[PDB]
Amino acid sequence: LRPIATPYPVKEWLQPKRYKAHLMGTTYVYDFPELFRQASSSQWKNFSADVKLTDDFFISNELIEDENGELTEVEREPGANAIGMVAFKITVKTPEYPRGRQFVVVANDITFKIGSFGPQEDEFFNKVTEYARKRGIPRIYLAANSGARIGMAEEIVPLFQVAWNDAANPDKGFQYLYLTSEGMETLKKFDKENSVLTERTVINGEERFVIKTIIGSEDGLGVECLRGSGLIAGATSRAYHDIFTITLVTCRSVGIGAYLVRLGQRAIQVEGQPIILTGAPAINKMLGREVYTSNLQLGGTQIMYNNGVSHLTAVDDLAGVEKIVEWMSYVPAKRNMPVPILETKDTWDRPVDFTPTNDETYDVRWMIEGRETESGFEYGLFDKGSFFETLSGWAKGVVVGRARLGGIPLGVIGVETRTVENLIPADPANPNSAETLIQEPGQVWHPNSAFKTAQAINDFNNGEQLPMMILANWRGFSGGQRDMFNEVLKYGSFIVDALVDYKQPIIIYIPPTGELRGGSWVVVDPTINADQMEMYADVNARAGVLEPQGMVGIKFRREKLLDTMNRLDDKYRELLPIYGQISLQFADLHDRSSRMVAKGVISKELEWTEARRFFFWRLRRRLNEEYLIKRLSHQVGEASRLEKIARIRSWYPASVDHEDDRQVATWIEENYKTLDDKLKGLKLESFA
Amino acid sequence: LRPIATPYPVKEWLQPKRYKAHLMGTTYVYDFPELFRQASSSQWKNFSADVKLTDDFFISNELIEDENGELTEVEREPGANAIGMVAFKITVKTPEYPRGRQFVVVANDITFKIGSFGPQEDEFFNKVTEYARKRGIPRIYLAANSGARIGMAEEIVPLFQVAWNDAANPDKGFQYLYLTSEGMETLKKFDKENSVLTERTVINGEERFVIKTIIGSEDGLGVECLRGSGLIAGATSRAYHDIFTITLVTCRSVGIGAYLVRLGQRAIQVEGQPIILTGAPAINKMLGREVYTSNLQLGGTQIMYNNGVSHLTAVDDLAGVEKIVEWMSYVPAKRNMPVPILETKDTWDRPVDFTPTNDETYDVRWMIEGRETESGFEYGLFDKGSFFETLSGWAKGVVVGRARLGGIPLGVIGVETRTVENLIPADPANPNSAETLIQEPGQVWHPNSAFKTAQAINDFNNGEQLPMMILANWRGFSGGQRDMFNEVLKYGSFIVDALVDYKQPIIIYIPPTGELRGGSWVVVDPTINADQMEMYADVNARAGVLEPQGMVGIKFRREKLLDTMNRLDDKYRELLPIYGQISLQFADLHDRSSRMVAKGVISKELEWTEARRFFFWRLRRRLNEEYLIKRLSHQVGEASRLEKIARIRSWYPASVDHEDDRQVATWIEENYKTLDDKLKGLKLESFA
Numbered sequence A, B: 001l002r003p004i005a006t007p008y009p010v011k012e013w014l015q016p017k018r019y020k021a022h023l024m025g026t027t028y029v030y031d032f033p034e035l036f037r038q039a040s041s042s043q044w045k046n047f048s049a050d051v052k053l054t055d056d057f058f059i060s061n062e063l064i065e066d067e068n069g070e071l072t073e074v075e076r077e078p079g080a081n082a083i084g085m086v087a088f089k090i091t092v093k094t095p096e097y098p099r100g101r102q103f104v105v106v107a108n109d110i111t112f113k114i115g116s117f118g119p120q121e122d123e124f125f126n127k128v129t130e131y132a133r134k135r136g137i138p139r140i141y142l143a144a145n146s147g148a149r150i151g152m153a154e155e156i157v158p159l160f161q162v163a164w165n166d167a168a169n170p171d172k173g174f175q176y177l178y179l180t181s182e183g184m185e186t187l188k189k190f191d192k193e194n195s196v197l198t199e200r201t202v203i204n205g206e207e208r209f210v211i212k213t214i215i216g217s218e219d220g221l222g223v224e225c226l227r228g229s230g231l232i233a234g235a236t237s238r239a240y241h242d243i244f245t246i247t248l249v250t251c252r253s254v255g256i257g258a259y260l261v262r263l264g265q266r267a268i269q270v271e272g273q274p275i276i277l278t279g280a281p282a283i284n285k286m287l288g289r290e291v292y293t294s295n296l297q298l299g300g301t302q303i304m305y306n307n308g309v310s311h312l313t314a315v316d317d318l319a320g321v322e323k324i325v326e327w328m329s330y331v332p333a334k335r336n337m338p339v340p341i342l343e344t345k346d347t348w349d350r351p352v353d354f355t356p357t358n359d360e361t362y363d364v365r366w367m368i369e370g371r372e373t374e375s376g377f378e379y380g381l382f383d384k385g386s387f388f389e390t391l392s393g394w395a396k397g398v399v400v401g402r403a404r405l406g407g408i409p410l411g412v413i414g415v416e417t418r419t420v421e422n423l424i425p426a427d428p429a430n431p432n433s434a435e436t437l438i439q440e441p442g443q444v445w446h447p448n449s450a451f452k453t454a455q456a457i458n459d460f461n462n463g464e465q466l467p468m469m470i471l472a473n474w475r476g477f478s479g480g481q482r483d484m485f486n487e488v489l490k491y492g493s494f495i496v497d498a499l500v501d502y503k504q505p506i507i508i509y510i511p512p513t514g515e516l517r518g519g520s521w522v523v524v525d526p527t528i529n530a531d532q533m534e535m536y537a538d539v540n541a542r543a544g545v546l547e548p549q550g551m552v553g554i555k556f557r558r559e560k561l562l563d564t565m566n567r568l569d570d571k572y573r574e575l576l577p578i579y580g581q582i583s584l585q586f587a588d589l590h591d592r593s594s595r596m597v598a599k600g601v602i603s604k605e606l607e608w609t610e611a612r613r614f615f616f617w618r619l620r621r622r623l624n625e626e627y628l629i630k631r632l633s634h635q636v637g638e639a640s641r642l643e644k645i646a647r648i649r650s651w652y653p654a655s656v657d658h659e660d661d662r663q664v665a666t667w668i669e670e671n672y673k674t675l676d677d678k679l680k681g682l683k684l685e686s687f688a
């Protein structure tokens, strides 16, 4: 029966599957809407202690397929799913969407045939993805599965006979497998003749139906699960370019399960749940030897989070879900909505407190989110508490996150100035093969950090649809043998390709003690995408083709020194010490932000402590002008960006200074509806 | 003077730069059109010994910028270039384009400031790329360069004075650098006050103009070369999605030079010419120790061709150019032209000769291009001699190439069944760190072979604009620790993403002894892109979720055997040997192409020896129906692929069997112009 004397009903007995799920260290699929409700709740509590919710703040509906295969909402009993894939549509009012926002969750039912993917789960999962794409609404996937479903035609097992080379002597081989008349019948009576393909023969006496192929009556044995999982691999791929996708790995993801996790890109892994391609036993079986002890060895976090396959880890499901929800709070409600402004106690109008010093090491995170100290909080460039770092465990050379600038959400990339000690494990399959330690210097791009940067940019672009700031501060790419061989050129280029695709505003900003130097500058220069990119250098930054040291090695050598000695010494070789020094200073006079301005390679030179005030409005002004540029784009007789921009600006009042971000932003917001009348007025002129 | 008594004029003296070029082991830039003429010539000789060319068969024009910055054609004297970038527009009649085809070549002039990129070279290179894009015409780049141009404000060197902490004692430091009245003048007279930024002071006596930034009068010192090379990085990126790009590395490519090589993707490297990010001396200088001896260590072929950064190597320039020309012969004349049919003595109507056997090892290349033998040539699937393998030196697990099916050019990917022994060099920078050898089993995807496959697919798609065949034959992905850690999931997914983008017809075809198995099938299944993809399995192929061995381990264990013993033995544990065998055979009866048909996961099951005849027409029929589907696409009231396809087919005569490739192809080609009248007829109906 039950556990006997509990105060409320025992749920794991009302529905024994809930227990099955738990036995396998995961939340029962029908309990996940409850986890999301719990997390939305916490989101509110953290934003405003005092606000009063009701249960109408959060709604979950199961989605199922109707009589014509369309999805609808139903309210039914947890456990009634006939297939092993389940979905909910969720409408939730959040701090960022007080009147409510929507998304779908799809989820493997780990208790239904080991949460394996058969054809029916695959067609369902695909319908759910399309339902989300069509509405523009984000698609959360909760992966707990065993990969594709394996089978065999059980109905043939008790039937088939064998053609012995000679009987009384199995021993020596067989010719082929077959059925008898009475085999054939047993199939016809069970309505199942389609289960084999055969050929009549008679052999000395009887008649024999040679099996030539076994098809099986039960759907979901072999290749139909393959077509199955192809469909949804492709379906996820497309998703990722279309709507916010994200995946929580909740008890294990195997096979197509693993690839689904990656194709939707954004993934959070729960400690102790593996993302694998095949299991340890099956690999050991192939290799013939017990090399791997657990799946955790192959697809646990020490692998997938160190990869960048896993963007975050989580301590359990609920923590998983809190992350999804928080990641999701930077993201527009549907495809092509404005990004969700959300202002907190940290208004835009303040100095930036925390400032790097030249001789002093620091964590760039301090510059981004500020820093607790002995004598109080020192604010950084973005809103206190608003920094959601992702890919934290891979390629620690860059740091990438989401954050808010006075409410405005954006992707952020900073450069980590401390040396990373990246440690690569021995691979147990290799007889002997030791742990290997990689020193990764700071403000140098390596293959992995270049990859991560590119990756980050695409993930801001793709469903997140965010603007972006890059706090650029690289001295260059590593171009020594190991890193060339590992294709630093390949991953460097990804960065350019991603910049080219980017569809929202981008600020590049060389910070106070920062630099950009040859290659690193190039990969990030505005001309790569003049439609979206703008560059700023702090007054205490440096940029140019070489370091002053490198510069001197080539354009201020012995002869050039001595000759300067020749004119700065009334006396005139024991001055090298200081003349070398002079030359270094002479180079460095070339690398100033003043010169960047002079050559018009940057938009402004900034002062760090004034940066937040500047970027808040610059960004705000830009989102407003973008929105207008779009409105215009949807006319008929289309035109260059330059032309559209030009004629939007011809709408501003004559006194408005186009260069003044606050003024322009404020006037646009005072006039959206007037601006809108103006478009309406064009549309009529724009038949011809 | 000269070398004295030569029969014709000494060219390296008429133009001394030609000699400079040669001294550095490369062709003088103005001699490259001649190399292309020599190669086009050879192309003709190989196609038809007897055909009679004249000099009007090949035309090269220099392109330069006119008075308003537009490019035009000129005929002038080699050496007259004022900037260090040079370009030609080339019109050439080829076997594939008898009436002629066009492309541009841009090229560093290695003799002009070490072929470095300044702002003027960068704006020129960009204009040339746009000129090519606008016309749809391929862009060849000939890289021999020193990267970005470094400089300093030479005019300030003789002038600046120093503020000593105390003079007669340089020793102990300096405050700042400055100029005098007479400094200032020297600048004003040379018209150059903009060269520094200064501030008046008077110090005990005189007056001092403190240098605060050095700008310099000469353009092309620092950051303006950075904006420069950003522009063209982006410009190449876009190129690659737009027109056929390719790059020959001809004496060395450095810096932005290296990245340009990669961004345009298709690269051929001449043995002994490095593709580097920084030089050895400069790296050794950073690291403080002579670790690297040559640039060849960092960017020679043993690195870049083993990378896949270099698609081919070449023995010298001319061989470089022959490759470009041959690669280029598979490619449409401009963006969106039909791919260039070209039939040879190897007509479509023949059996395929060479056939793999189960116990016998072979080189898949034999299946593709056929095989010379003791007793004569045995033809493979494609036209004899027509296979142009690329990426030959990287990730030998797959083989990728271009080839012709009865004249029709296509991308081909096959799987290499032999074990690759991939050997990774010691990295000299690491104190001690030995050469490491990697065993890569056949018909298994690894990170690199997955990458290469994805890479290949994109390069067929992107300017080549080719259809594609994949001879699919993978047992699966490697999912053991090393390959998980190295992100096999990441590169696997690239493959799906590329399939999704593909815009021409795709045949997937499991060959005679071949298989696809779980994951490998999925990554390649038609539902990923039903618009372009079709799958075929040979009658002797196998596919399904597991190997029969793996299948048995899970669905036919001890209990299930014994019980079969129980009914197949009048007698009934010494039969394991053979019953295990029976079960394996029982599984395998599930994995037949007959079952694939039954479940409609493939379009047809094929016989290898009939495959060429089948695919020739299937492909031909498809190109014709594609062309029509496009024509339709350019209407107004647009519609699903399904709908367009449906109504094109409603145009075929009633007797035409839609299923008959030859019939349909032949009727379309007999009626292009009638079909065209039909479209004209729609266009009028399609205002409303």
Ligand SMILES: C=Cc1cc(C)cc(CC)c1C1C(=O)N2CCOCCN2C1=O
Binding pocket: A476, A477, A517, A518, A519, A520, A522, A523, A545, A546, B146, B147, B148, B149, B150, B225, B226, B229, B233, B254, B255, B256, B257, B259, B277, B278
């Ligand atoms: C990492 C090298 C690199 C990469 C990119 C993308 C762009 C550029 C041009 C500034 C470089 C360059 C770079 O760092 N250098 C180092 C200085 O030598 C002069 C040549 N040089 C480059 O051209």
Ligand SMILES: C=Cc1cc(C)cc(CC)c1C1C(=O)N2CCOCCN2C1=O
Binding pocket: A146, A147, A148, A149, A150, A225, A226, A229, A233, A254, A255, A256, A257, A259, A277, A278, B476, B477, B517, B518, B519, B520, B522, B523, B545, B546
């Ligand atoms: C490499 C594993 C993989 C990868 C992809 C893309 C698709 C699929 C589903 C067939 C697989 C799968 C795969 O090979 N298997 C192995 C058999 O176990 C059952 C689970 N399984 C998969 O789901």
